[PDB]
Each structure stands twice: as C-alpha cells, then as structure tokens.
Design a protein around this ligand. Structure first.
Ligand SMILES: CC1(NC2=NS(=O)(=O)c3sc(Cl)cc3N2)CC1
Lengths: 608, 325, 148, 325
C-alpha cells in the first residue's frame, strides 16, 4: 500500500538487475532528490532571515534593485509551474490505468512544483534584500535539477520513448527550462561578480526609489506584483483607516514626470524638423510614445490569442463527453489522450484565462500610463506656446481664452482617451484573422458562408462610420460655439439682467444648442443603426451557418461541441464590433483635437 | 501620550526602516534564542524531524540502489537489514540519530556508502543535538523571568528628607534567593532642547542615587526606599507640584541590574514612572517589622503612602528661601 | 454607458441562470464568490472614492493656472516670470498625473480581482458540468451551454 | 595610512615575532574555540572519526588474536560476535561510542580484554562527547555575532551643546532584546610624544562620556547621541576644523561593552572614526518620533546630519573668547 512504484508482478519495478539508472522508479527518486535539497536548504534560511521579524522590530527595505534576467527568470518560473502542473496531470492520468498507485508518476512533479514556488520566494526575498551570495544554493539546485532531468531524458532516449508520448515532451521542456534558469544564474554571476572572482559590481538602486519619496511602486515591483498590482494592497488597506491625500500619494517617477515626457516630445518634433500641422503632430506622438503603445498592443495580442483557448477547450470537453503503451513497465499517455480528457482541458482553460486576464490588464495599464504621460507632455507644450504666444491672437478674434483652456480641459482629454483606445484597434485584425481561421477549422465551408455574411455588410458599416464621423464633427463644431456663447453670457450676466437681454442671449445659445442637437440626433440615429447591424450580424451569421451546416452541406454532423465552440468564437469575434460608434467618436474627437492643437501651436508669437 | 517603558519593564520603542538585514543573517543564534516559545518549539521539532527525514530518504535511496527493496531472489547481504519501505528507512534513521538502536534494522559491511552515510548522520546528529539542547536550555535559563519577581512601587514619591526634597522610590524582591552585585540606574527621559536649537526627542539624563559611597550598588534582602536628592545639579531642580499631570513630558525610569545568585546570569528589571504617577507631599510607610524571632516584610503595604507636610515650592525656590534665611 | 451596462448586467444574470439550470450545485459555489466580490467592493470603493476626489481637486489648480496665465500673460511676461510660472505648471501637472495614476492602478487592482473571480467561475462550472456528464447524464449538449 | 580599528570593529594590529609558543600549548581550549568554522567542523569530525578508527583497530586486533576472523571451525565463543573484517570492527566501534548498540555485534564474557577495552572506549567517548559538544555550543553561543546588530553612525560629529563644543556620536541597536549593563569606553589614538622625548606610536588616551553621573553606563532601547564635552582636560582641546583630513594622525574609537540579555555572555562592539570622518559644524537629526501608540525609530535617517552654525575656532580659542567677554 502507497508504494513508490506499484506492487505489480511481485514488485518487479524495484529490481535493479538490469541497471540502477535503467529503472524508472530510481530515476524518479533521483528527480525527487534536488527538490528536497532545495526545501531543506531554503526553509531555515528564509525562516531565520524573514521569519525572525517581531512586532517590536520591523525590517523594511524601502529601496531595492533587480538582478539581471529578472523578467526572464519570472517568466521561466511561470512556465516551469505550468509544465509541472501538466506533469502532475499526466502522472495522475497514467496512474489511473493501473490497479496499484504508482507514486513515482506525480509525487516527483508535485515536489518539483513546491520547490519551484519555494525557489521563487527565495529569489524574491534575496532580491528585495540584496544578498547575491545566497543565490549559490539556487544555482546548486538548478544544476542538480538539470542533471537529474537530463539523466531521465537520456534514459528516455535509450528506451526509445519518442515524441508521441507527452511525458517525454514534458521532460524535454523541463530540461530546457532548468538549463535556461541555470544560464540565468550564470548571467547573474557574470554581470554581478558576487562570487570570489574579482571585484563585484554594485548596480546601486534607482534614485527615484532611493530618496525622491515616490510611492507609485509599479515600475519597481516584480512581474507577479506588476501584473496582479499587489503593491496597491496596502493603499487599499490604509484608505480604510486614513483618507488618501497628496501626502499618501508620493511624487512622480522620473520616467513619468511632465518635464521628461515634454523633452521627449520636443526631441520627436526636432527630429521631424531635421513644422506643426496635424500629420507632424501624429508622427511626433508616434516617435515619442509608440514603443509603449507597441508594448500594450503586444499584451493585448497575447490576450487575444489566449482568448481562443476558451472555444477550443469547449470543443474538446464537449467532444469527449459525447463519446496505451507499456514501455518501461509504466503506462504512458500520449498528447492526443492527454489533451483529449475533460478535467485537463478545464485546468488548461483556467490557467489560460488567468494569463489572458493578466495580459489584458497589463495592456490597459500600459496604454493608460502612456496616455497620462502624453497628457503631461501636451499640457507642457501648450503652456510653453502660451508663454511664447502673442496677445494679438486673442485680440483679433483668432482664438479665445476659453478655447485655449479647452485645449487642455477637453482636447487633451480626447487625445488621451484615443491613446487609451489605440492598442485595441491595433490588435483587432490579428484576432479577427485567427478567429476566422479557427471558425473554418471547427465548422468548414459553413464558417466561410457566415464570414461572407459578416463581410457583405462591411460597406454598410463603413457608410455608417463615415456618417457618424461627420455628425460628431458637426457636434463638436456646434458645441464649441455653444460653450463660447454660454461663457460670454455668464461673465456678462449683470449687464444682461440690467438691460433685460437675458432671454435674447439665452435664445442664441438655444439656437446653437438646437444645431448641436440636430447633429446629435443624426449621430444617435446612425448609432442605433450601427448597434442593430452589429447585433443582427451575429444572429444572421449563426443562423445561416447552422442551417447551411445541415440543410446545404453534409460534411459532418452538427454536434454540441462544434456548435457551441463556434458560438463562442462568433461571440468573441463580434464583441469588438459592438463599440464601433464609441470607437469612431473617440477617433474623430482625437483628429479634431490634434488639428486644433496644431492650429494653436502654429500661431503667431512675440519676436525677440 | 506614548510611554517609553511600561510599568512591567516592556520597552515600547518600535524599530522600523532597518535597511541592514545581513546583521541578522550573521547573528543566527540570537535570532534562534529570542524567538517566542511556540516558534522555538516548532524549530526544535522541525530540525530533528527534517534531519530524520533527510537521512531517511538517503537510506531509502541506498537500499533502492542495492536492490534491497525488491523482494525477489534472496541470500544477498543488504546495506541495512530489514529495510522494506520508506517507513523502514525512517525508523532506521530515527534509530541511528537518537542512538536508540533496536537492531532489527542494522548497517552491514557489504556497502561502504552505508558506512559513510552512517558516519555523516552521526556527526550531523551530534551537532544538531548540541546546538538544539543548548538553545533550549539557554532559553529556559533566561534571566528575564527573574525580573518578574523583582517589584517596584506603583507610585513614585517626592518628599523632604534632611531638607533636600528627595525623589523616593521603593524596590522589592519576592525571592528568598539573593541578587549578586545589584546596581540601580535611574534616568529622566524628556524632550530637552539645547540653547543652540537641537531637539532630542527621548533625551535620557541619568540622576544619581544617594548610595552613600557615590556608587550604584545596593543590597536587596529587604525592600529599600531609593531616593535621589534633588539638588542644583539635578534635572528636577525646577520641578514643581504644578506639574505632574498626565499631559506632561516628564518620565523617570529605574533599572535594576543584577546577577541571579542561583544561575549566574545577569538580569535587568525596568520600571518607569510618568508625571501623574509621582506623588507630591507623600511618603512611603514602613513595612518591615520585627517578627517573633526575625524580621517580617509586610508586602500588602508595599505601595502604601501617607500625606506628609511638604513645601509646594520647587527646589530652586526652596534653595532661594534657605539662602534668604 | 447605458447600452453597455444593460448588455453586461443582463448577460451576467442570463449566464448565471443558465449555469444554475444545467448545474444546480454551482449555486452552492455561487454564494462564496458573491461574498468575495462583496469584500472587494468593500475595500476598493472607499479607496477609489478618495482617489477620484483627489484626482478632481488636483485638476482645478491645473486648469485655473491656464486661465490666469492667458489673461495675465502681459503681466507675467512683464515681470519676466515665465520660468516661475512654467515651474508652477510642472508642479500642478505632476500632482494631477500622479493622482490619475493611482486612480488607474486602483482600477487595475479591482479588475484583476474581478477577472480572477470570473476565471474561478469558469473553473467551478466546468468541474460541476464535467463531473455530472461523467456521473449523471446531461445529454452532452447542456454542458456546452453552461461552458459557453 | 593604516587603520587601528576598522569601522566594523575589526582590529588590524598584526602580532609578529612571538617567541613564546608554550603559552599557546598550555591554552588548548582557546585555540580550539577561536578557530574558523570550517576548521572547527574539521576538528569535530576528525576527533570522533579518529576515536572510532582507533578503537576499531583495537577491536579488530582483539578479534584477530582470538581467532574470530578465521572462518574455520565453530562453536567457539568470540570476544565480540559477528566481527568478520575491519568494517565489522569499525561498525561495532561506532555502535559502542555513539551508544547506538544494534546488537548484531555485541561484547561477550569470554574475553576480559574486550570488557576492559569496552570500559576504556566508553570513558574516552564520554570525554570526547563532553569536550566537543561544549566546544561547538560555546562557538555557536559566542557574543561576537551580537555585536553585528549593534550599529554606530558612519560619521562622527562636532557641534556646540550648551556652548561647550562637544564631540557627538550615535549608537543604535537593531534588536528587540536588551543589553544588560551597557558601558561606553571612548578613546583617542594618536602618536603623542612626551616632552622628555618618549614616542608612543599608538597612544590611547580615553575621553569621558558625559553620562550625568560621571560613569559609563547607558540605556540602549533607542538610539542615543553620545557626546564627549571638549574641555580643558580633553585631548581634543586644541582640535581645529583646519584638521580633520585623511592624512591626519587623529583616531577616535568607541567601545560598547555589554551583556547580552538572552545568553548572559558579555559582548563587545567596536567602531573607530578617522579624522576625515568627523564632521565639523554638523548635527545629527532626530530619528525617534511618536507612532500611533508608541515610539518609532526611523533607522533610514540614522547617519543623517545637517549643517549647523558652529564656530571655527578651537576649544582653546573659544574658551579664550569666552574669558575675554
Ligand atoms: C452570449 C452567448 N450566447 C450567444 N451569443 S451570440 O453569438 O450573440 C448568438 S447569435 C444567435 Cl442566432 C444565438 C447566439 N447565442 C453565450 C455566448
């Protein structure tokens, strides 16, 4: 009972007559060894260093620096945890065939999972405490792990397992990940020579985290706390006990300061000149902030690719609910049998959903941070134009002070929200292409008919979008005049009351508002047309596919797996089309804002 | 307001923003001794249990490598006899390290690696035994518990002895056993500001105890009244009975540093007095009286004081009135 | 916002009703998540209400700093106070930007928590539906309904 | 220039040309305790391993002398049962000395020399156990590691307190646990020459700490500013801010001698200040502030000083200017 290898053929798996390394159970125990070594080294060191804190003495590192390969190490650790979860699942699936329970299939992988979690906790505590000489133990562990896994892989090569078996692929992936983490440790030794080899290099912590008193720790936290926003937690706690003020919020980091983004935008404009206009402003914004926009678009692209793991998992799960090789004395599970399953697909769907949501929130945060830096740079440039402006611009009716203040209060906000919405527009066509390809893979020619039904209303969609853009241009044009007339009525209200001219100027503001409401009525009519079109396109497409899949074509049965996976794919593909009116409104408000910003920046100045 | 030292001797100062962590990593023994009792019990259990488990895994892997776990065939000398599973290796590791040695499971001469692992396990077990038993005995023999039986009066007193307006206390010992070379260190903690402009938030200025030899040594068989004469050099030279309320900066701490006679380890007993706990015009009652054949100390009257006619002027004003007369 | 809110708040209740129909045991696990959500809405809403207000009260001295700069432009440039007022703008812009950044990161904190709860909803519903279809027959079509 | 004491307390003095070696031969225990950790681990392993090997050779020679190693004949009582080779004697010596006693190999009553060797091995094993475990525990419980958690400010300061131009420091404790009867010994090390012509290369003249009672005792809950008033009796009476560069003979060392409360073993923490590390016209900032319900010590500002208007005259010239006014 509870033997490490099951008591089959009178415990023939414990015989080492052929070879000590030619026994899978012994190689599994050798794989158990480095995880036990890492736990037994790390637990007293972690308990002494960070568990000896008391209520009277609290030890806090207000400043920290990151080791080289930090992002790579956290990514490799996450991939290691994923592959070890898959190895636990494969070992449980392989052990379920046999009558006795073979503990060597899943207990080494569970011990490895615990060791990987313990190693990343050890690395984070070391990194936030800056003790590079304590990384040696991690180095030893990775070396030991790599060696043991290499032995397993080599023995799997000697018995000719092959790539049809999933445990061979997981063993090779584990060898690759352990070697990559060993190379990361060697890179840490090379860049920072903490070991007894010449003079070590002190990176020194960044100055904004050092003594600037910043409390926005998002550039300075690790990828787990950068993606889950864990550092915010204390703020969310302290807002219960004390109200959040401008002292609890610190100072801006140097990369996020208004002067830094303003100088970056000035460098972009100078690179353009070596002036103004809307197109040059757009290219200057591209040169200054498009790298961060590409980073947010990459996170959104990865989230879109992992969003298709939903419908594919539904396909596999429902297909299994609608319904082998002995090797070295232990049953193996192929990749088709592993990915077939049902609970394995649920676990993979859960992990893919977690990764997709983390990537999507990272994309949203990077886009909004880029928009806020853009707002700071644009406000600084507007004010620098104001300090170099001529009063003859305001004195001859070319511009009014309300319009100059609305360049900050309104137009910069519109450009900022369009910079929020930019990565979704950049990453939409990749999602559309992969969704149509997966629809064809699940359905076939019926999905081509449904995609043709979607495509056949694209000229109507473009016509509605152009009409919406014209209506919103008219709305902005009338709203600026209405705000100007309302401002001049409110500032001179006493004269209007004394002369009894309040109703006349109110009627003029009503006339301008009536023109604005005509433009808004046109926008709302075409918005209702767009919403009805983008909500009847999925219904008509789903109906035409699921009628043509049985009445017209006889290639395959309908089945719940194909139908519900295609339903999920159709819903995912038509979800970005729901917000077409908001997208075109934000885009045309950005275009108007950039155009009048270019008109203001190319105005008259005071000669030296 | 915050209290620097509690009446039971607990120091309320919180240490924060400690950037240097490697001082604690170099000092492992002091981290191990100063843990709480459940934490030291947990570490004492876990160190022995982990050593048994680790060497058990080594013994099990050795018996696996020799084919001892396989029940097939026979008449082969194992590395360790009667090792059949992980439980057998765990029991054998316990028998080796605690040196019980039942001998149903016994090392043999066939495997030299078994002999090497036996040597390594014995050396590691001796080291763990020495360190852990010494840690537990040093924690039990700590001198913090002896300071619990040292008591101080709850209210400090200010009265007139030989016309000098002394600040009096009362210490006491609840133990038959003595305290060797007992010394008394009294300090006054405030927020004194220098004339140049330096503000020290917890400025501790020590006050002399009137010993009689100009030293700190006391003899603590019976409860003693410990009096600091408030003179021109005293920090309390301008202290008034119009002071001594709760919202007053004054604190006075008394430290009894001694050696426990029975263990030889030095102990420290602390007790602080706030301003509202210093009574003006009061005096400690006598508590020691001659018994049937010896002296008896009435500890029920230990904190008892009585009203005594004392001038309400400060020591400055009392000295000026003495100089005028 | 009204159209988006109607679509979201009705697809949520429709989906919870559908999963409750195909798997009633999900209702047993519907209660703790609704507890957890509540605690998250307990902790976020106090913070966000501060961070919104602090974002608004930092926007007023920024915008007003433009309003006095344009009307007093001759006066500021006559005193040669252009650099001082540009430095004042840098201070105001930094205050407003970091208030907006803390509001943004608080929103991302809340959305990470809520989306992880949604992933837990998918995992729990999948476990219940798959265990049913292997134990108590669901015709293998209601499972696709519940997962979708 | 050379440093007498490092900032971490390491004393850089090298002892050479020691003709007397028999002092070290008489003092074996201090040589054994003061070895490095790999050397003490090596000696701890080698003493037990050599005792096991030596008594193993004795047991093997006894079993050879009795004919127990010969497999010929039978029904003869051996001195020790199941002794067949040197490995059997080594395992049996390990079983005897560590008192495991598996009992597959067991002393018999046939040979009295086996009983005598068993007695001698048990006595030698008890002695080696006592000496080695006590050495390892005394090395682990050493008070040098406690001095790591005692910190000193990196820069000494000279400012004006009550118009006396004091030399100030800052000590600090990173531990919750107290230090019992803590004393401060400050010295000034130079190359002072007597008027007769005697040159002392490392002349240490101690300077008094302004305690308030004329003693050395301090209380170390919170970080303290330790100030020596530079008066006419001070060695720094002629010290100038035109001095205090790197190529200056002045060194000032501070020694914190205490008793660890948790172990009872006295500890010594040292920190020296060169001339360039003494700042003129600077003052330590306050780091202790009232927390939510207690006092909090900001250790991030521990070494922080600020510029303070201080006279650039020496204490001689300041005293002469005071006497002129
Ligand atoms: C919300 C979900 N159900 C759904 N989405 S849909 O693609 O809008 C569409 S169209 C049509 Cl006909 C029937 C359906 N059913 C579950 C995805």
């Amino acid at each position: 009972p509870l033997a490490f290898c099951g008591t089959e053929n009178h415990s023939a798996a414990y015989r080492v007559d052929q070879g000590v390394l030619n026994n899978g159970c012994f190689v599994d125990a050798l794989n158990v060894v480095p995880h036990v070594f890492l736990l037994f080294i790390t637990f007293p060191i972690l308990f002494i260093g960070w568990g000896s804190q008391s209520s009277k003495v609290h030890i806090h590192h207000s400043t920290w620096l990151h080791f080289p390969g930090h992002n790579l190490r956290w990514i490799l650790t996450f991939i290691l945890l994923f592959v070890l979860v898959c190895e636990i699942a494969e070992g449980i699936l392989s052990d379920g065939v046999t009558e006795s329970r073979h503990l060597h299939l899943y207990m080494p992988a569970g011990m490895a999972f615990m060791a990987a979690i313990t190693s990343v906790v050890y690395y984070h505590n070391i990194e936030t405490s800056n003790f590079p000489k304590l990384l040696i133990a991690l180095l030893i562990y990775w070396t030991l792990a790599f060696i043991t896994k290499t032995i397993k892989f080599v023995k799997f090569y000697d018995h000719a397992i092959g790539f049809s078996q999933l445990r061979f692929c997981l063993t090779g992936l584990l060898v690759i990940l352990y070697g990559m983490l060993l190379l990361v440790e060697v890179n840490v030794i090379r860049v920072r020579r903490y070991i007894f080899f010449k003079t070590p290099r002190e990176v020194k912590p960044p100055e904004d985290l050092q003594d600037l008193g910043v409390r926005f720790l998002q550039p300075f936290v690790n990828l787990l706390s950068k993606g889950t926003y864990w550092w915010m937690n204390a703020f969310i706690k302290t807002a219960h006990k004390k109200p959040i003020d401008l002292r609890a919020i610190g100072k801006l980091p140097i990369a996020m300061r208004a002067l830094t983004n303003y100088q970056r935008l000035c460098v972009a404009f100078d690179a353009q000149a070596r002036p103004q206009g809307a197109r040059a402003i757009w290219r200057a914004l591209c040169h200054a902030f498009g790298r961060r926009l590409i980073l947010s678009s990459t996170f959104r692209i990865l989230a879109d690719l992992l969003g298709f793991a939903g419908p594919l998992c539904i396909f596999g799960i429902v297909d299994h609910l609608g319904k082998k090789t002995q090797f070295l004395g232990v049953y193996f599970v192929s990749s088709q049998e592993f990915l077939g399953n049902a609970y394995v697909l649920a676990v993979l769907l859960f992990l893919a959903l977690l990764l997709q949501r983390t990537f999507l929130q990272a994309s949203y945060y990077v886009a909004i941070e880029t928009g806020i830096n853009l707002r700071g740079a644009i406000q600084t440039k507007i004010y620098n134009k104001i300090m170099h402006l001529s009063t003859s611009n305001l004195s001859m009716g070319e511009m009014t002070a309300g319009q100059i203040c609305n360049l900050v209060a309104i137009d910069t906000n519109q450009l900022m929200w369009f910079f929020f919405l930019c990565p979704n527009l950049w990453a939409m066509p990749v999602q559309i292409i992969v969704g149509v390809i997966l629809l064809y893979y699940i359905l076939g020619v019926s999905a081509l008919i449904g995609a043709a039904v979607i495509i056949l209303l694209a000229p109507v969609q473009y016509f509605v979008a152009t009409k919406l853009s014209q209506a919103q241009r008219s709305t902005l044009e009338h709203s600026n005049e209405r705000l100007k007339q309302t401002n001049e009525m409110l500032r001179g209200m006493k004269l209007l009351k004394l002369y009894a001219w309040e109703s006349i100027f109110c009627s003029r503001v009503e006339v301008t508002r009536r023109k604005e409401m005509t433009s808004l009525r046109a926008f709302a009519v075409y918005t209702s047309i767009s919403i009805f079109m983008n909500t009847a396109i999925p219904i008509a497409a789903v109906l035409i596919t699921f009628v043509g899949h049985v009445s017209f074509f006889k290639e395959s049965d309908l089945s719940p797996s194909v139908a519900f996976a295609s339903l999920s794919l159709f819903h995912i593909l038509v979800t970005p089309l729901f917000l077409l009116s908001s997208v075109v409104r934000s885009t045309v408000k950005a275009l108007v804002s950039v155009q009048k910003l270019s008109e203001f920046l190319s105005s008259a100045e005071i000669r030296e | 307001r915050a209290r620097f030292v509690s009446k039971k001797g607990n120091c309320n100062v919180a240490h924060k923003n400690i950037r240097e962590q490697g001082r604690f990593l170099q000092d492992v023994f002091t981290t191990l001794v100063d843990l709480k009792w459940p934490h030291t019990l947990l570490i004492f259990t876990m160190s022995f249990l982990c050593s048994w488990l680790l060497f058990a895994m080594v013994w099990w892997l050795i018996a696996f490598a020799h084919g001892d776990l396989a029940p097939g065939e026979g008449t082969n000398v194992p590395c360790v006899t009667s090792i059949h599973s992980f439980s057998s290796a765990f029991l054998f590791s316990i028998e080796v390290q605690v040196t019980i040695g039942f001998g149903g499971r016994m090392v043999t001469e066939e495997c030299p690696l078994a002999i090497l692992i036996l040597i390594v396990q014995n050396i590691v077990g001796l080291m763990i035994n020495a360190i852990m038993l010494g840690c537990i005995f040093m924690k039990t023999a700590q001198a913090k518990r002896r300071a619990e039986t040292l008591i101080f009066s709850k209210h400090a007193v200010i009265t007139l002895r030989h016309g000098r307006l002394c600040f009096m206390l009362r210490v006491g010992d609840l133990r038959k056993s003595m305290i060797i070379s007992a010394t008394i260190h009294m300090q006054v903690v405030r927020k004194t500001t220098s004339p140049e402009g330096e503000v020290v938030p917890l400025h501790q200025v020590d006050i002399p105890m009137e010993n009689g030899v100009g030293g700190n040594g006391i003899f603590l068989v019976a409860p003693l009244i410990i009096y600091h004469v408030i003179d021109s050099n005293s920090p309390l030279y301008d202290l008034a009975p119009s002071d001594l309320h709760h919202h007053q900066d004054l604190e006075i701490i008394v430290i009894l540093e001694g050696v426990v006679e029975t263990t030889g380890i030095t102990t420290q007993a602390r007790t602080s007095y706030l301003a509202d706990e210093i009574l003006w015009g009061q005096r400690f009652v006598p508590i020691v009286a001659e018994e049937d054949g010896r002296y008896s100390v009435d500890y029920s009257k230990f904190g008892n004081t009585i009203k005594v006619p004392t001038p309400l002027c400060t020591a400055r004003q009392l000295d000026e009135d003495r100089s005028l007369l | 916002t009204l159209e988006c809110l109607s679509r979201s708040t009705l697809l949520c209740v429709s989906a919870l009703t559908v999963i409750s129909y195909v798997t009633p045991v999900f209702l047993v696990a519907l209660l703790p998540l609704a507890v957890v959500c509540y605690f998250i809405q307990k902790y976020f809403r106090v913070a966000s209400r501060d961070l919104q207000q602090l974002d608004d009260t930092t926007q007023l001295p920024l915008l007003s700093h433009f309003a006095e700069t344009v009307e007093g432009l001759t006066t500021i440039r006559a005193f040669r106070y252009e650099a001082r007022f540009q430095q004042k703008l840098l201070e105001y812009t930094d205050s407003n930007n970091i208030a907006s950044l803390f509001l943004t990161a608080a929103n991302r904190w809340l959305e990470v928590r809520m989306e992880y709860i949604g992933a837990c909803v998918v995992l729990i519903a999948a476990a219940t539906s798959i265990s049913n279809s292997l134990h108590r027959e669901l015709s293998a079509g209601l499972v696709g309904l519940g997962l979708t």
